[PDB]
Amino acid sequence: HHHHHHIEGRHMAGPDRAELAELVRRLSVVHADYYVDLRRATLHHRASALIGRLMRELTADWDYSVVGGLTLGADPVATAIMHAPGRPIDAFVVRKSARLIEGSEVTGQRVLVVEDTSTTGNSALTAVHAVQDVGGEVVGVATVVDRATGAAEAIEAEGLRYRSVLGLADLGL
Amino acid sequence: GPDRAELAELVRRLSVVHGRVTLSSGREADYYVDLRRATLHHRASALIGRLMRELTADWDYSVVGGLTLGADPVATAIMHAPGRPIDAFVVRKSLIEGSEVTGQRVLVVEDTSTTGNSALTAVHAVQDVGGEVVGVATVVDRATGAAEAIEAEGLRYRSVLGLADLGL
C-alpha cells in the first residue's frame, strides 16, 4: 500500500529529467523483490550533475541562499545544487549527533533542506530543527525521489513545503 | 597561478577563524582552522575541485572519496569539476557508500589532515574491499606529520596548499 504523493517534478518534463530517471533505475534499483540504493546515483558523476540542475529548477520560485540536510544522505544532493550553474548558493551539513551545523552560516538566512529520499520524514524534520535552533529559516524541503511512504505528508503536516523531482513510477516500481 | 591564489585567500578568510578559544587540546589560542567553511562554499569548492584534479592529473583513478565528514565535499567537488568522469564514495566509521571501489583505482582525499589517521582509516577501508589506492590528496597540509605517516605506508601524498598559505 503506497501513500501516493504529488511529484512536482512531473512539470519539468524534458530530456534531463528522463536521463536522470534512467540513471537512477540503472544505478540504484536492483530487481523484497527489489531494493533501492540512491547513494549510487547521488555520488555518480552524471546523475549528480543532473540532480543539481533539476533540484534548482524544482525550487526556482523559492528564496534561499544556503542548502543542506541531515548527513549522510543529504550531503551530495546539497553539494550538487551548490555546484550546478546559476546564482551562488552555499552548502551546509547537519550532523546526526554531537555545533550540529557544519559549513556555511545559516543564522539569519533562508535555507532549503534537502534529502535524497525521505524514509519516515524524521530526518528532514531533524535538519529543520537544527537550522531553526540557530536562527535559520527553512523555506521548504526538496528531495530527489519520493517513494510514497508517507514521509511527504509527515513533513507537510509540520507546516513545511515539500517537492520531489521523481516518484515511484520513475523507478519502474 | 591565479586559481591557487584565489583559493588560498578564500581559505584564510573563511577557515582561519579568529577569536579567543580554548582549543580541543585544552590549550587557548587566537584562532582555529575550520576547512568546512571553505569546502562547503560555492566558489572555494569549485576551485578545490579544479585544483585537486590538476594536482593529481598524472594519477590513474576512476573514484574519489574519504572519511566522513571532512572528505565528502572535497570528493564531490572533484566529481563536479569539469574533466573526465570521476565518481565519488564516502567511508563511514563502524563501510563504503556510493560508487563501487572494489576492483577500481581510487584517490583518497581529506580536507586537512593532522595525524593522517582519518585518511589512513579511509585508505584501509578501501583496501579491505579490494580498492587499489593510488595516493592521498588534501586541500591543506599543516606540517603536522601527516605526510610522513601516509608515505610510511607506501602511498604518495600531495596537497594543494601548505601551512605558509594560511598566513599565520
CB pairs under 8 A between A and B: 97
After what residues is chain B interrupted, C–N > 2.5 A?
94
Chain B partners of A91 at a C-beta cutoff of 8 Å?
A: 40-42, 45, 73
Q: Which three cell numbers stand for residue B25?
A: 587540546
Resolution (A): 1.9
Query: Considering just the CA atoms, what is the radius of gyration of chain B in Å?
Result: 15
Asked if residue A165 lies in contact with residue A54, where contact means CB atoms within 8 angstroms, the answer is: yes
CA distance B152 to chain A (A): 30
C-alpha A71/C-alpha A31 separation (Å) is: 27
Nearest to B47 by CA among B136, B114, B140, B122: B140
Task: Please report the DSSP string for A61-91 in residue order.
Answer: TS--SEEEEETTTTHHHHHHHHHSSSS--EE
Q: Tell me how the structure was determined.
A: X-ray
Q: Within 10 A of A2 (CB to CB), how many other CB atoms are there? A: 11
Ramachandran angles phi, psi of B19, nearest 5°: 135, 160
Asked if residue A148 lies in contact with residue A121, where contact means CB atoms within 8 angstroms, the answer is: no
CA distance B97 to chain A (A): 7
Q: What are the boundaries of each domain within chain A?
A: 1-173
Chain A partners of B74 at a C-beta cutoff of 8 Å?
A: none
Chain B partners of A45 at a C-beta cutoff of 8 Å?
A: 79-80, 85-88
Contact B80 A44 (CB under 8 A): no
- DSSP-derived secondary structure letter, A149: B
C-alpha B147/C-alpha A107 separation (Å) is: 37
CATH tag for A1-173 (out of 3.40.50.720, 3.40.50.2020, 3.40.50.920, 3.40.710.10): 3.40.50.2020
Asked if residue B18 lies in contact with residue B7, where contact means CB atoms within 8 angstroms, the answer is: no
C-alpha A66/C-alpha A72 separation (Å) is: 17
Sheet of A110-115: strand order equals A101-103, A90-94, A66-70, A110-115, A137-145, A162-166
C-alpha B8/C-alpha B23 separation (Å) is: 23
CATH number attached to the domain at B1-168? 3.40.50.2020
B137's CB contacts (< 8 A; 6+ apart) are: B52, B55, B56, B107, B108, B109, B157, B158, B159, B160
From the list A43, A71, A82, the residue facing B99 with the nearest CB is: A43
